[PDB]
Paper text:
Nonribosomal peptide synthetase (NRPS) enzymes, usually composed of condensation, adenylation, and thiolation domains, are involved in peptide natural product biosynthesis to produce antibiotics and siderophores. Activity analyses show that the A. baumannii homolog activates L-Orn and the full-length protein produces isopeptide polymers in vitro.
The α-amino groups of all three substrates, L-ornithine, D-ornithine, and L-lysine, interact with of Asp217 in co-crystal structures. Glu221 showed charged interaction with terminal δ-amine of ornithine substrates or the ε-amino group of lysine indicating an important role in binding. Michaelis-Menton kinetics showed a preference in the apparent kcat/KM of over 160-fold for L-ornithine compared with L-lysine. All four structures were solved in the same space group P212121 with two protomers per asymmetric unit.
Residue numbers in the entry: 7 to 171, 178 to 411
């Protein structure tokens, strides 16, 4: 019996024998005629999206892409970016996402580091990649008709699903991300009826909360243009105009909203702990306001907190099947109250840092207190924390 190890709810059924392609293919076959993507006035259905991405994936397979390969992704915000991400996924490979504003030299560095077999871009952007040695395919050429269908080798849960980036490549597995999706959505509860704002760059974790939760339940995505992403008041009006029901964002953006958006079902605030003033402003009755915390090394999020006016803001309790404990300099578990390094365990702990066994073995360590085979690996956040007399974890800055 120990009050110094804090777990999320027990849900072994969130650990399935699945991969991202399985989740999306299920959603697309179940709701082919449902609209999946919205870009201004263009709309694509789940069935249309699935077929187009499958054609692109067969083209990747023809060009030599197989499960376990890493494919760079660099396209403008929009339907084509998401379709290309999905095409990489359907091919069985993991994608390395690049923000719109990534300099070509950084792209080259990341592709080299990951040993990527190639990357997807557009014709317009293809010219900008002269100094990139790796193979560069255009969505256009990958969308050409095929004279015969190509069988796609399936990938395994232990294979990478994506790699998030001097550069540190964090390797997230199919297992990691599929479990994270099911775990967080058991609490958030994104529904198929929802209309979800898609404003994050695919290089950030919260883009997964936007896109792939929606894929999981078949919600509809309204993809924000680059112009809108930097205009909080124009965005505050756009959310009302399009009647978006789900918004993932960081506290500062919400704090820059002039009025309320009453038609927002769920408000998931990542990035930073929400200030009390923003809670009192937005934790309204017709709003379910959440604050999600977690390092990229444990798949998007690790804990989630339901915000309420007058309830002090904390990082919440771990997500289902996630766990948190506090250790000291000697890598040994501390009794409650005595502060130390916050560590996270569970099935969504990343594989580690790509091609850097030194640092990986330094920060991903054996868990001597695992109560199952999914808890055998602790990621040391580098944060300092303590468990209070309420079983709640409190962050206390960096080490
Ligand atoms: N919901 C989590 C917020 C995003 C944070 N994990 C990050 O590393 O960017
Ligand atoms: Mg991090």
């Amino acid at each position: 019996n120990t009050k110094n190890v804090i777990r999320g709810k027990y849900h072994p059924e969130f650990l399935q024998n699945e991969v991202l392609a399985d989740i999306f293919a299920h959603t697309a076959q179940t709701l082919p005629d449902k609209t999946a993507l919205i870009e201004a006035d263009k709309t694509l259905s789940y069935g249309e999206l699935y077929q187009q991405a499958l054609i692109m994936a067969q083209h990747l397979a023809l060009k030599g892409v197989k499960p376990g390969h890493i494919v760079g992704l660099w396209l403008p915000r929009g339907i084509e970016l998401l379709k290309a991400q999905l095409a990489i996924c359907l091919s069985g490979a993991a994608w390395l996402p690049f923000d719109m504003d990534t300099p070509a030299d950084r792209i080259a560095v990341c592709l080299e580091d990951a040993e990527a077999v190639g990357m997807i871009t557009t014709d317009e952007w293809y010219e900008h990649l002269a100094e990139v040695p790796q193979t560069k395919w255009t969505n256009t050429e990958l969308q050409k008709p095929l004279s015969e269908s190509v069988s796609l080798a399936k990938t395994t849960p232990d294979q990478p699903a994506y790699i998030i980036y001097k550069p540190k490549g964090i390797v997230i597995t199919q297992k990691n991300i599929c479990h994270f999706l099911r775990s967080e959505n058991s609490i958030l509860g994104i529904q198929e009826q929802d209309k979800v704002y898609q404003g994050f760059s695919v290089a950030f974790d919260m883009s997964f909360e936007e896109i792939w939760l929606s894929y999981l339940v078949g919600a509809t995505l309204w993809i924000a243009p680059k112009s809108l992403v930097s205009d909080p008041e124009r965005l505050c009006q756009t959310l009302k105009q399009e009647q978006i029901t789900v918004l993932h964002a960081v506290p500062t953006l919400l704090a820059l909203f002039p009025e309320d958006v009453p038609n927002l079902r769920i408000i998931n605030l990542g990035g930073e702990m929400c200030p009390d003033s923003l809670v009192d402003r937005w934790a309204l009755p017709h709003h379910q306001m959440f604050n999600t915390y977690g390092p990229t090394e444990t798949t998007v999020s690790a804990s989630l907190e339901l915000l309420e006016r007058g309830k002090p803001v904390t990082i919440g309790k771990p997500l289902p099947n996630y766990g948190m404990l506090v250790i000291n300099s000697e890598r040994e578990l501390l009794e409650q109250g005595e502060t130390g390094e916050l560590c996270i365990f569970g099935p969504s702990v990343a594989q580690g840092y790509l091609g850097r066994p030194d640092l990986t073995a330094d920060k991903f360590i054996e868990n001597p207190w695992a109560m199952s085979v999914e808890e055998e690996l602790l990621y040391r956040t580098g944060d300092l924390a303590k468990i209070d007399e309420f079983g709640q974890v409190h962050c206390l800055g960096r080490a």
